mmCIF file of all heavy atoms in Angstrom:
data_model
loop_
_atom_site.group_PDB
_atom_site.id
_atom_site.type_symbol
_atom_site.label_atom_id
_atom_site.label_comp_id
_atom_site.label_asym_id
_atom_site.label_seq_id
_atom_site.Cartn_x
_atom_site.Cartn_y
_atom_site.Cartn_z
ATOM 1 N N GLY Z 1 -3.995 -24.726 -0.491
ATOM 2 C CA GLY Z 1 -4.607 -24.047 0.654
ATOM 3 C C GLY Z 1 -5.739 -24.812 1.335
ATOM 4 O O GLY Z 1 -6.372 -24.276 2.231
ATOM 5 N N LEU Z 2 -5.995 -26.068 0.950
ATOM 6 C CA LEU Z 2 -7.122 -26.782 1.563
ATOM 7 C C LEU Z 2 -7.047 -26.822 3.087
ATOM 8 O O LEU Z 2 -8.070 -26.622 3.761
ATOM 9 C CB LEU Z 2 -7.270 -28.199 0.976
ATOM 10 C CG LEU Z 2 -8.464 -28.980 1.518
ATOM 11 C CD1 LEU Z 2 -9.768 -28.349 1.051
ATOM 12 C CD2 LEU Z 2 -8.382 -30.456 1.038
ATOM 13 N N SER Z 3 -5.864 -27.055 3.657
ATOM 14 C CA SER Z 3 -5.793 -27.073 5.133
ATOM 15 C C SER Z 3 -6.120 -25.712 5.747
ATOM 16 O O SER Z 3 -6.598 -25.656 6.890
ATOM 17 C CB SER Z 3 -4.437 -27.573 5.633
ATOM 18 O OG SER Z 3 -3.412 -26.703 5.183
ATOM 19 N N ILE Z 4 -5.858 -24.625 5.017
ATOM 20 C CA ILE Z 4 -6.221 -23.297 5.498
ATOM 21 C C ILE Z 4 -7.740 -23.213 5.577
ATOM 22 O O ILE Z 4 -8.293 -22.863 6.626
ATOM 23 C CB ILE Z 4 -5.703 -22.184 4.552
ATOM 24 C CG1 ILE Z 4 -4.153 -22.221 4.471
ATOM 25 C CG2 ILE Z 4 -6.195 -20.821 5.079
ATOM 26 C CD1 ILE Z 4 -3.574 -21.331 3.322
ATOM 27 N N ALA Z 5 -8.414 -23.600 4.496
ATOM 28 C CA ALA Z 5 -9.861 -23.496 4.454
ATOM 29 C C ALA Z 5 -10.505 -24.408 5.494
ATOM 30 O O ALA Z 5 -11.499 -24.029 6.142
ATOM 31 C CB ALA Z 5 -10.372 -23.837 3.048
ATOM 32 N N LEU Z 6 -9.935 -25.586 5.714
ATOM 33 C CA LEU Z 6 -10.499 -26.442 6.749
ATOM 34 C C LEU Z 6 -10.362 -25.837 8.142
ATOM 35 O O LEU Z 6 -11.252 -25.991 9.013
ATOM 36 C CB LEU Z 6 -9.791 -27.821 6.734
ATOM 37 C CG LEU Z 6 -10.183 -28.753 5.584
ATOM 38 C CD1 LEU Z 6 -9.140 -29.834 5.354
ATOM 39 C CD2 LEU Z 6 -11.573 -29.465 5.856
ATOM 40 N N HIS Z 7 -9.253 -25.157 8.386
ATOM 41 C CA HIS Z 7 -9.017 -24.614 9.704
ATOM 42 C C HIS Z 7 -9.813 -23.335 9.973
ATOM 43 O O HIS Z 7 -10.353 -23.167 11.082
ATOM 44 C CB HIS Z 7 -7.512 -24.345 9.859
ATOM 45 C CG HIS Z 7 -7.070 -24.229 11.279
ATOM 46 N ND1 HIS Z 7 -6.191 -23.260 11.720
ATOM 47 C CD2 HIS Z 7 -7.339 -25.012 12.346
ATOM 48 C CE1 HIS Z 7 -5.981 -23.422 13.017
ATOM 49 N NE2 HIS Z 7 -6.657 -24.486 13.416
ATOM 50 N N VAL Z 8 -9.882 -22.427 8.997
ATOM 51 C CA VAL Z 8 -10.538 -21.132 9.241
ATOM 52 C C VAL Z 8 -11.865 -20.921 8.526
ATOM 53 O O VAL Z 8 -12.527 -19.879 8.705
ATOM 54 C CB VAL Z 8 -9.574 -19.939 8.953
ATOM 55 C CG1 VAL Z 8 -8.304 -20.090 9.818
ATOM 56 C CG2 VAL Z 8 -9.228 -19.830 7.453
ATOM 57 N N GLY Z 9 -12.258 -21.896 7.714
ATOM 58 C CA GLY Z 9 -13.513 -21.801 6.988
ATOM 59 C C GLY Z 9 -13.365 -21.194 5.610
ATOM 60 O O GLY Z 9 -12.410 -20.453 5.352
ATOM 61 N N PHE Z 10 -14.295 -21.504 4.717
ATOM 62 C CA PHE Z 10 -14.154 -21.005 3.333
ATOM 63 C C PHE Z 10 -14.330 -19.518 3.137
ATOM 64 O O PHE Z 10 -13.721 -18.945 2.228
ATOM 65 C CB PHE Z 10 -15.058 -21.795 2.341
ATOM 66 C CG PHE Z 10 -14.403 -22.005 1.017
ATOM 67 C CD1 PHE Z 10 -13.432 -22.974 0.881
ATOM 68 C CD2 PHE Z 10 -14.702 -21.185 -0.069
ATOM 69 C CE1 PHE Z 10 -12.772 -23.140 -0.304
ATOM 70 C CE2 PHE Z 10 -14.019 -21.349 -1.283
ATOM 71 C CZ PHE Z 10 -13.065 -22.338 -1.375
ATOM 72 N N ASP Z 11 -15.178 -18.883 3.941
ATOM 73 C CA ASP Z 11 -15.391 -17.450 3.809
ATOM 74 C C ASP Z 11 -14.058 -16.771 4.079
ATOM 75 O O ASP Z 11 -13.624 -15.882 3.326
ATOM 76 C CB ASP Z 11 -16.403 -16.943 4.834
ATOM 77 C CG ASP Z 11 -17.852 -17.252 4.461
ATOM 78 O OD1 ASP Z 11 -18.180 -17.855 3.407
ATOM 79 O OD2 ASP Z 11 -18.755 -16.871 5.282
ATOM 80 N N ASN Z 12 -13.402 -17.204 5.156
ATOM 81 C CA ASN Z 12 -12.090 -16.614 5.476
ATOM 82 C C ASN Z 12 -11.061 -16.909 4.374
ATOM 83 O O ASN Z 12 -10.244 -16.048 4.056
ATOM 84 C CB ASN Z 12 -11.574 -17.075 6.853
ATOM 85 C CG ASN Z 12 -12.315 -16.425 8.014
ATOM 86 O OD1 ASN Z 12 -12.525 -17.060 9.114
ATOM 87 N ND2 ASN Z 12 -12.710 -15.172 7.824
ATOM 88 N N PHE Z 13 -11.108 -18.091 3.780
ATOM 89 C CA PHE Z 13 -10.153 -18.413 2.705
ATOM 90 C C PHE Z 13 -10.446 -17.522 1.489
ATOM 91 O O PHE Z 13 -9.519 -17.010 0.845
ATOM 92 C CB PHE Z 13 -10.241 -19.913 2.338
ATOM 93 C CG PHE Z 13 -9.245 -20.355 1.297
ATOM 94 C CD1 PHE Z 13 -7.886 -20.393 1.588
ATOM 95 C CD2 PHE Z 13 -9.663 -20.728 0.009
ATOM 96 C CE1 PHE Z 13 -6.940 -20.791 0.621
ATOM 97 C CE2 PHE Z 13 -8.733 -21.152 -0.962
ATOM 98 C CZ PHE Z 13 -7.368 -21.185 -0.672
ATOM 99 N N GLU Z 14 -11.726 -17.322 1.178
ATOM 100 C CA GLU Z 14 -12.065 -16.411 0.074
ATOM 101 C C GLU Z 14 -11.637 -14.977 0.393
ATOM 102 O O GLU Z 14 -11.249 -14.244 -0.512
ATOM 103 C CB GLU Z 14 -13.553 -16.461 -0.247
ATOM 104 C CG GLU Z 14 -13.938 -17.762 -0.924
ATOM 105 C CD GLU Z 14 -15.421 -17.788 -1.291
ATOM 106 O OE1 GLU Z 14 -16.254 -17.232 -0.541
ATOM 107 O OE2 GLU Z 14 -15.750 -18.381 -2.330
ATOM 108 N N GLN Z 15 -11.723 -14.562 1.661
ATOM 109 C CA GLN Z 15 -11.240 -13.203 2.007
ATOM 110 C C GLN Z 15 -9.731 -13.089 1.788
ATOM 111 O O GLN Z 15 -9.252 -12.055 1.286
ATOM 112 C CB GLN Z 15 -11.596 -12.812 3.446
ATOM 113 C CG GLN Z 15 -13.134 -12.561 3.557
ATOM 114 C CD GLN Z 15 -13.647 -12.729 4.978
ATOM 115 O OE1 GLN Z 15 -14.790 -13.232 5.195
ATOM 116 N NE2 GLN Z 15 -12.840 -12.328 5.943
ATOM 117 N N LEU Z 16 -9.005 -14.161 2.118
ATOM 118 C CA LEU Z 16 -7.550 -14.213 1.887
ATOM 119 C C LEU Z 16 -7.257 -14.063 0.381
ATOM 120 O O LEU Z 16 -6.441 -13.227 -0.036
ATOM 121 C CB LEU Z 16 -6.986 -15.537 2.459
ATOM 122 C CG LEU Z 16 -5.527 -15.846 2.136
ATOM 123 C CD1 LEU Z 16 -4.563 -15.040 3.024
ATOM 124 C CD2 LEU Z 16 -5.328 -17.362 2.319
ATOM 125 N N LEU Z 17 -7.970 -14.822 -0.451
ATOM 126 C CA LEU Z 17 -7.786 -14.688 -1.905
ATOM 127 C C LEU Z 17 -8.159 -13.277 -2.368
ATOM 128 O O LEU Z 17 -7.514 -12.697 -3.264
ATOM 129 C CB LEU Z 17 -8.678 -15.704 -2.663
ATOM 130 C CG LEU Z 17 -8.435 -17.185 -2.431
ATOM 131 C CD1 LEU Z 17 -9.485 -18.053 -3.101
ATOM 132 C CD2 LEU Z 17 -7.122 -17.567 -2.893
ATOM 133 N N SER Z 18 -9.215 -12.717 -1.791
ATOM 134 C CA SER Z 18 -9.661 -11.390 -2.236
ATOM 135 C C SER Z 18 -8.649 -10.300 -1.912
ATOM 136 O O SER Z 18 -8.518 -9.324 -2.674
ATOM 137 C CB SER Z 18 -11.032 -11.066 -1.624
ATOM 138 O OG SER Z 18 -12.002 -12.025 -2.061
ATOM 139 N N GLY Z 19 -7.993 -10.409 -0.743
ATOM 140 C CA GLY Z 19 -6.951 -9.439 -0.397
ATOM 141 C C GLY Z 19 -5.810 -9.485 -1.409
ATOM 142 O O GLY Z 19 -5.277 -8.461 -1.846
ATOM 143 N N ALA Z 20 -5.423 -10.699 -1.757
ATOM 144 C CA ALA Z 20 -4.410 -10.870 -2.808
ATOM 145 C C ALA Z 20 -4.901 -10.246 -4.138
ATOM 146 O O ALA Z 20 -4.154 -9.567 -4.822
ATOM 147 C CB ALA Z 20 -4.090 -12.341 -3.015
ATOM 148 N N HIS Z 21 -6.168 -10.484 -4.487
ATOM 149 C CA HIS Z 21 -6.702 -9.904 -5.710
ATOM 150 C C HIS Z 21 -6.669 -8.374 -5.709
ATOM 151 O O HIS Z 21 -6.413 -7.769 -6.745
ATOM 152 C CB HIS Z 21 -8.136 -10.432 -5.975
ATOM 153 C CG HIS Z 21 -8.637 -10.117 -7.353
ATOM 154 N ND1 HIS Z 21 -9.862 -9.512 -7.611
ATOM 155 C CD2 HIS Z 21 -8.059 -10.333 -8.558
ATOM 156 C CE1 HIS Z 21 -10.014 -9.385 -8.926
ATOM 157 N NE2 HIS Z 21 -8.928 -9.847 -9.515
ATOM 158 N N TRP Z 22 -6.963 -7.760 -4.563
ATOM 159 C CA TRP Z 22 -6.882 -6.321 -4.434
ATOM 160 C C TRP Z 22 -5.462 -5.861 -4.763
ATOM 161 O O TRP Z 22 -5.251 -4.932 -5.584
ATOM 162 C CB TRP Z 22 -7.257 -5.878 -2.997
ATOM 163 C CG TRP Z 22 -7.344 -4.357 -2.953
ATOM 164 C CD1 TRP Z 22 -8.478 -3.570 -3.121
ATOM 165 C CD2 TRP Z 22 -6.244 -3.445 -2.787
ATOM 166 N NE1 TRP Z 22 -8.134 -2.237 -3.078
ATOM 167 C CE2 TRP Z 22 -6.772 -2.130 -2.883
ATOM 168 C CE3 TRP Z 22 -4.863 -3.605 -2.586
ATOM 169 C CZ2 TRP Z 22 -5.976 -0.998 -2.775
ATOM 170 C CZ3 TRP Z 22 -4.050 -2.445 -2.494
ATOM 171 C CH2 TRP Z 22 -4.616 -1.171 -2.582
ATOM 172 N N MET Z 23 -4.484 -6.531 -4.168
ATOM 173 C CA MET Z 23 -3.093 -6.124 -4.383
ATOM 174 C C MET Z 23 -2.650 -6.376 -5.833
ATOM 175 O O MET Z 23 -1.847 -5.630 -6.385
ATOM 176 C CB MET Z 23 -2.184 -6.882 -3.381
ATOM 177 C CG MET Z 23 -0.694 -6.474 -3.422
ATOM 178 S SD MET Z 23 -0.377 -4.717 -3.051
ATOM 179 C CE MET Z 23 -0.876 -4.644 -1.339
ATOM 180 N N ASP Z 24 -3.186 -7.436 -6.438
ATOM 181 C CA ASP Z 24 -2.859 -7.710 -7.831
ATOM 182 C C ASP Z 24 -3.341 -6.544 -8.680
ATOM 183 O O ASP Z 24 -2.659 -6.135 -9.613
ATOM 184 C CB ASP Z 24 -3.602 -8.943 -8.311
ATOM 185 C CG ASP Z 24 -3.072 -10.238 -7.677
ATOM 186 O OD1 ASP Z 24 -1.939 -10.243 -7.147
ATOM 187 O OD2 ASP Z 24 -3.743 -11.305 -7.676
ATOM 188 N N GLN Z 25 -4.535 -6.030 -8.370
ATOM 189 C CA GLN Z 25 -5.054 -4.907 -9.172
ATOM 190 C C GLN Z 25 -4.243 -3.645 -8.904
ATOM 191 O O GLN Z 25 -4.009 -2.862 -9.829
ATOM 192 C CB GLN Z 25 -6.541 -4.687 -8.865
ATOM 193 C CG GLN Z 25 -7.408 -5.828 -9.448
ATOM 194 C CD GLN Z 25 -8.778 -5.865 -8.806
ATOM 195 O OE1 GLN Z 25 -8.934 -6.369 -7.679
ATOM 196 N NE2 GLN Z 25 -9.766 -5.363 -9.506
ATOM 197 N N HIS Z 26 -3.819 -3.441 -7.659
ATOM 198 C CA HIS Z 26 -2.958 -2.305 -7.357
ATOM 199 C C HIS Z 26 -1.674 -2.397 -8.178
ATOM 200 O O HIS Z 26 -1.232 -1.424 -8.822
ATOM 201 C CB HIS Z 26 -2.612 -2.249 -5.846
ATOM 202 C CG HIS Z 26 -1.525 -1.263 -5.529
ATOM 203 N ND1 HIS Z 26 -1.771 0.087 -5.363
ATOM 204 C CD2 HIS Z 26 -0.183 -1.432 -5.357
ATOM 205 C CE1 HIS Z 26 -0.628 0.707 -5.097
ATOM 206 N NE2 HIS Z 26 0.352 -0.192 -5.091
ATOM 207 N N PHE Z 27 -1.054 -3.572 -8.147
ATOM 208 C CA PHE Z 27 0.226 -3.742 -8.844
ATOM 209 C C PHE Z 27 0.080 -3.582 -10.342
ATOM 210 O O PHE Z 27 0.944 -3.011 -11.001
ATOM 211 C CB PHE Z 27 0.767 -5.141 -8.526
ATOM 212 C CG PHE Z 27 2.008 -5.541 -9.307
ATOM 213 C CD1 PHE Z 27 3.131 -4.715 -9.379
ATOM 214 C CD2 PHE Z 27 2.055 -6.797 -9.923
ATOM 215 C CE1 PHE Z 27 4.279 -5.123 -10.058
ATOM 216 C CE2 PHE Z 27 3.203 -7.219 -10.591
ATOM 217 C CZ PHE Z 27 4.320 -6.354 -10.673
#
């Protein structure tokens, strides 16, 4: 995901990971 973080910034990349983490806990 490095190109993602370079394009949208690390805060946004961490938000992307956090959304996945939310769903992991749901599942």
